[PDB]
Amino acid sequence: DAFVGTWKLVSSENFDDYMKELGVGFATRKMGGMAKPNCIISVNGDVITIKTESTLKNTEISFILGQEFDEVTADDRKVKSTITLDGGVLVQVQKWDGKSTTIKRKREDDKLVVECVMKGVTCTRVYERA
Numbered sequence: 050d051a052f053v054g055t056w057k058l059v060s061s062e063n064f065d066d067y068m069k070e071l072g073v074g075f076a077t078r079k080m081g082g083m084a085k086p087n088c089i090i091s092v093n094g095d096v097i098t099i100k101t102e103s104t105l106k107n108t109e110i111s112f113i114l115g116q117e118f119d120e121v122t123a124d125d126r127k128v129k130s131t132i133t134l135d136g137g138v139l140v141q142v143q144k145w146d147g148k149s150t151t152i153k154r155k156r157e158d159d160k161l162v163v164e165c166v167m168k169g170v171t172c173t174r175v176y177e178r179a
């Protein structure tokens with residue numbers, strides 16, 4: 050939809066702090082910190098796919114809005130995830146071990162803006178079309 054495309058990361062703020070707040074170790078935060086992934090969003094029928102592609106690691110999720118799914122994250126958490134569309138924003142929550150984190154994806158002008166929150170840490174990542 051408004052989201053469908055191939056997106057390339059152009060800016061990131063507070064991502065190391067976000068990863069730290071989630072308990073991610075040094076080696077994975079080192080891989081994530083200066084990675085500039087592509088995010089490939091597609092839709093077919095009920096099913097949305099989001100691929101995150103980067104030199105040292107690729108991940109993918111496919112889901113139906115409102116339907117919880119199991120996800121293995123890039124930092125190897127086993128989480129339960131639910132994604133909904135609220136006011137044009139794709140809102141993802143991941144739940145594990147009594148914890149939660151949100152990843153919100155929105156379109157603003159030419160940007161795909163991704164806000165990641167864990168506790169008191171807010172990270173913002175900005176993608177532009179490839």
Ligand SMILES: O=C(O)C1=C(C(=O)Nc2sc3c(c2-c2nc(C4CC4)no2)CCCC3)CCOC1
Pocket residue numbers: 067068071073077078080081084086088101103105106122123124152163165174
């Ligand atoms: O911008 C995005 O799509 C988002 C995320 C993302 O790109 N994460 C990447 S790309 C990447 C790596 C990680 C990574 N994340 C984590 C923890 C934070 C979750 N540990 O490693 C590690 C291996 C190299 C490539 C995560 C938050 O949701 C939005």
